[PDB]
Amino acid sequence: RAFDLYFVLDKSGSVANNWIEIYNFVQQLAERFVSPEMRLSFIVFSSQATIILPLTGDRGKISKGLEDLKRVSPVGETYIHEGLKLANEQIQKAGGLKTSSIIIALTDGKLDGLVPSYAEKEAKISRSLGASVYCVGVLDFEQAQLERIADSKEQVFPVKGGFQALKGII
Amino acid sequence: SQGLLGYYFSDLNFQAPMVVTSSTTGDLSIPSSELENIPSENQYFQSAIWSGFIKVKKSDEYTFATSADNHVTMWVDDQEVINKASNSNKIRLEKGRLYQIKIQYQRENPTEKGLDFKLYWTDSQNKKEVISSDNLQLPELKQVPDRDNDGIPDSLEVEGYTVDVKNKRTFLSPWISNIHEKKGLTKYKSSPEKWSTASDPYSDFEKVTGRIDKNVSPEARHPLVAAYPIVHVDMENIILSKNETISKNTSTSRTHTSEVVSAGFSNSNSSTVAIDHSLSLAGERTWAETMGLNTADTARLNANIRYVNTGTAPIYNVLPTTSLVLGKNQTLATIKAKENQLSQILAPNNYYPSKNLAPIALNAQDDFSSTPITMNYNQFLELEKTKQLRLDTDQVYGNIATYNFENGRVRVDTGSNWSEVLPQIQETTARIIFNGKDLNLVERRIAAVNPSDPLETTKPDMTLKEALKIAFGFNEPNGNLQYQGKDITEFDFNFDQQTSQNIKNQLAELNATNIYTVLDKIKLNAKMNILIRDKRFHYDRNNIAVGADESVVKEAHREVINSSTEGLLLNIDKDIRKILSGYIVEIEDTEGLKEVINDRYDMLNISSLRQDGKTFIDFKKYNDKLPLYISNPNYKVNVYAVTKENTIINPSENGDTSTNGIKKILIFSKKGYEIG
Numbered sequence: 001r002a003f004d005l006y007f008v009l010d011k012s013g014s015v016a017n018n019w020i021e022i023y024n025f026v027q028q029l030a031e032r033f034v035s036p037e038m039r040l041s042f043i044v045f046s047s048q049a050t051i052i053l054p055l056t057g058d059r060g061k062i063s064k065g066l067e068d069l070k071r072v073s074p075v076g077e078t079y080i081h082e083g084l085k086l087a088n089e090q091i092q093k094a095g096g097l098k099t100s101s102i103i104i105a106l107t108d109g110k111l112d113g114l115v116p117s118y119a120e121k122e123a124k125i126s127r128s129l130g131a132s133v134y135c136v137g138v139l140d141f142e143q144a145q146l147e148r149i150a151d152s153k154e155q156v157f158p159v160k161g162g163f164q165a166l167k168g169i170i
Numbered sequence: 171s172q173g174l175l176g177y178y179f180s181d182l183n184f185q186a187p188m189v190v191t192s193s194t195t196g197d198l199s200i201p202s203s204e205l206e207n208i209p210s211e212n213q214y215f216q217s218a219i220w221s222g223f224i225k226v227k228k229s230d231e232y233t234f235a236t237s238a239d240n241h242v243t244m245w246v247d248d249q250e251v252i253n254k255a256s257n258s259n260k261i262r263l264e265k266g267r268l269y270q271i272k273i274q275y276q277r278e279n280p281t282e283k284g285l286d287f288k289l290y291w292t293d294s295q296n297k298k299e300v301i302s303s304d305n306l307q308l309p310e311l312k313q314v315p316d317r318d319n320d321g322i323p324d325s326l327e328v329e330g331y332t333v334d335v336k337n338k339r340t341f342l343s344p345w346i347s348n349i350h351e352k353k354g355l356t357k358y359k360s361s362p363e364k365w366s367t368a369s370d371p372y373s374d375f376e377k378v379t380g381r382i383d384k385n386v387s388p389e390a391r392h393p394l395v396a397a398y399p400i401v402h403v404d405m406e407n408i409i410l411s412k413n414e415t416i417s418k419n420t421s422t423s424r425t426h427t428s429e430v431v432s433a434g435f436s437n438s439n440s441s442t443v444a445i446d447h448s449l450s451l452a453g454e455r456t457w458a459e460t461m462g463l464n465t466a467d468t469a470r471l472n473a474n475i476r477y478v479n480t481g482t483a484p485i486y487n488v489l490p491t492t493s494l495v496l497g498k499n500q501t502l503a504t505i506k507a508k509e510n511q512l513s514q515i516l517a518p519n520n521y522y523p524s525k526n527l528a529p530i531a532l533n534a535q536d537d538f539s540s541t542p543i544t545m546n547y548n549q550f551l552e553l554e555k556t557k558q559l560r561l562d563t564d565q566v567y568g569n570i571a572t573y574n575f576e577n578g579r580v581r582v583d584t585g586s587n588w589s590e591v592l593p594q595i596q597e598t599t600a601r602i603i604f605n606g607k608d609l610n611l612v613e614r615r616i617a618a619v620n621p622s623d624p625l626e627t628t629k630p631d632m633t634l635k636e637a638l639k640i641a642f643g644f645n646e647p648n649g650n651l652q653y654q655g656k657d658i659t660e661f662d663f664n665f666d667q668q669t670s671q672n673i674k675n676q677l678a679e680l681n682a683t684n685i686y687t688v689l690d691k692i693k694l695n696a697k698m699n700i701l702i703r704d705k706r707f708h709y710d711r712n713n714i715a716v717g718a719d720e721s722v723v724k725e726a727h728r729e730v731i732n733s734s735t736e737g738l739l740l741n742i743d744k745d746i747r748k749i750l751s752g753y754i755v756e757i758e759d760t761e762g763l764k765e766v767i768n769d770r771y772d773m774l775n776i777s778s779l780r781q782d783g784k785t786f787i788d789f790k791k792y793n794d795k796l797p798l799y800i801s802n803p804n805y806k807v808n809v810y811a812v813t814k815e816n817t818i819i820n821p822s823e824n825g826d827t828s829t830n831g832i833k834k835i836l837i838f839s840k841k842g843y844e845i846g
């Protein structure tokens with residue numbers, strides 16, 4: 001028994017000077033969870049959401065996904081809900097309640113308009129499918145906003161210093 | 171206004187009129203000074219006639235007298251009062267009653283230019299003065315050779331006349347080639363058989379003399395340009411809700427429907443409304459989802475509107491009635507205004523209510539009994555899918571403010587109605603629809619001949635050149651007919667099917683292959699329709715400009731005043747802006763790979779106008795409010811314009827909301843280091 005891991009990555013303009021913090025965080029998680037039983041997927045979102053790496057355990061594909069993430073130029077609005085949607089879709093198709101699934105979202109949690117409520121809803125859908133939602137805060141992230149997405153404050157960490165904590169919690 | 175209508179002749183026998191004018195008092199003189207537009211030899215007046223009424227303020231006996239009693243006959247209510255001598259005859263006059271006046275003057279031996287002539291009266295206490303201002307008034311010139319009773323002598327209307335403004339007086343004088351060309355006043359012609367040559371409510375004389383509603387368009391003061399109102403509804407914003415919220419701006423355009431490549435025939439009023447397809451709030455999706463609208467619900471609609479008069483005459487007591495329409499022909503609503511309770515007047519080139527005031531709401535909030543405007547589910551999806559409405563406005567305009575010759579005032583006359591006048595205008599004029607002002611269709615009608623009517627035989631000839639000048643203000647500063655810096659050849663001529671044949675035959679008859687060569691030779695007839703359109707643009711079937719060639723679009727963006735990670739500052743021409751629904755910003759890598767910043771059909775509204783007149787194309791607006799971060803100076807920032815005809819207004823059938831697939835036009839492309 002082991003895990004399916006979903007990276008939901010904010011590439012909006014508001015985090016562009018910190019893409020490197022986000023990339024590094026992803027690489028360093030991809031390097032820890034190297035077991036052949038583990039599968040990862042990389043998702044990026046700004047004003048659209050895109051699967052950069054479909055859920056997979058092949059080591060070559062992941063590596064290729066990382067090179068891909070490295071090329072990201074962050075720009076756009078912050079439609080986090082479209083990122084969680086793409087995670088949820090892949091989870092649904094993976095067996096759903098069958099799998100041990102985990103979403104990690106990287107973002108400053110700075111959401112506008114109807115995005116907080118659509119993220120909240122997508123987050124709840126995620127939990128309804130047997131997945132846990134974690135949020136790793138970038139910069140001066142909005143604490144409350146991320147608590148409303150993640151399972152609880154237990155699953156909300158700063159990016160800076162939250163690799164250690166996040167690996168023990170697994 | 172004034173007193174007696176005066177006609178001055180250079181001959182001795184009432185045959186060659188040199189001046190038609192009126193004077194406010196008994197001073198009927200025309201000094202040397204005022205004869206500048208009369209040939210020198212013709213400045214010797216050998217006879218004159220005056221005509222009108224006196225109302226007196228005190229009943230009494232009066233003696234009339236003039237400066238030249240031996241040269242004069244005078245009648246008062248058809249009795250002679252002076253006659254070939256200082257026939258000094260007391261006559262009773264009661265106050266409040268009007269008495270017809272006619273003075274005749276014949277002088278063989280004219281030793282002086284102009285005329286020095288004064289009409290006097292003496293009361294029974296022997297006080298003699300020049301008759302003062304509030305006694306003499308004009309003859310009733312409502313529907314001495316003057317067949318149509320407008321006041322302008324038949325000979326002048328047919329041969330042509332100049333209208334010259336003095337200090338108070340208007341001078342109406344015959345046209346002479348080698349004097350009036352040099353000075354820049356127009357040659358008027360009118361029908362001696364038609365009180366209003368344009369068939370409208372104001373006479374040829376009222377028009378050129380300014381005895382007319384102050385609100386009639388200045389061009390419609392020319393007797394060959396029709397004065398009538400043209401009204402459509404302009405919608406500003408709409409609010410949609412679930413019936414027991416979506417707020418969007420709208421743009422509206424008055425419309426003209428061609429047929430199948432050909433100008434149309436109908437005289438209806440219509441406008442089409444575009445509902446803004448750009449986002450209001452950050453996460454928004456489908457209108458339906460934002461609202462909570464399920465399959466059996468209804469939606470309610472409310473909107474702000476103004477009326478718009480693009481005609482040439484005002485409206486006073488009745489707004490036209492309007493159907494709000496969805497799709498081809500689902501009337502959602504009738505929009506009525508309370509008759510005879512207009513809060514202002516609806517003037518040419520103006521709005522109701524005027525721009526300094528709040529607009530009208532389809533359902534005002536005070537009014538608990540206003541009719542709700544509802545949509546069924548299916549219709550609301552239609553509205554979301556087409557984002558378009560149409561407003562059909564009838565031509566019912568109410569009563570007319572006409573001139574009254576006993577008051578000298580302009581008043582709304584309850585026997586005068588625009589419904590009776592409009593058909594006559596439509597029947598006896600040519601219609602030109604022209605879009606050069608700001609690409610809005612503006613309509614004008616010009617008096618023209620029906621070649622088949624035996625009584626139309628004496629109506630002025632109308633060429634296409636004159637019609638454009640007098641109706642729209644094209645002019646010829648340096649040999650070329652133009653409108654505001656734009657040559658006539660920058661505009662396309664399109665005609666209705668029948669006009670088209672007529673024009674084509676005229677050209678063949680002329681051996682001309684090109685209409686621009688022979689604009690002064692092409693004759694207009696009644697019932698022609700001419701559609702004149704800026705050549706830079708593409709037009710839909712309603713004749714709204716909806717796009718432009720890629721080349722034109724690219725050229726209009728050449729002038730890049732300033733560029734930066736925040737956006738572009740450019741000078742773009744007001745017409746071009748009108749045809750762009752938005753812009754797309756894209757970053758490109760060394761290897762040609764592309765990523766749109768504002769990557770959603772509803773995020774293209776990033777351009778805005780500045781007070782200095784310049785356009786800002788705002789990179790921050792959908793970049794979480796920040797300048798673009800260009801990690802590599804060898805990347806390009808490409809910026810694309812999207813035309814109206816190319817706008818996507820909803821997600822793809824497959825639910826794809828990106829800019830993927832949009833026909834867009836490259837208008838700027840620089841590298842990181844080339845911008846700064």
Ligand SMILES: [Ca+2]
Pocket residue numbers: 316317318319320321322323324327362
């Ligand atoms: Ca006349």
Ligand SMILES: [Ca+2]
Pocket residue numbers: 318320322327360361362363364365366367374
């Ligand atoms: Ca006339």
Ligand SMILES: [Mn+2]
Pocket residue numbers: 012013014015077078110794
């Ligand atoms: Mn952001």
Ligand code: NA
Pocket residue numbers: 372381382383571572573580
């Ligand atoms: Na009038």
Ligand code: NA
Pocket residue numbers: 401402403404439440441492561562563
């Ligand atoms: Na209308």
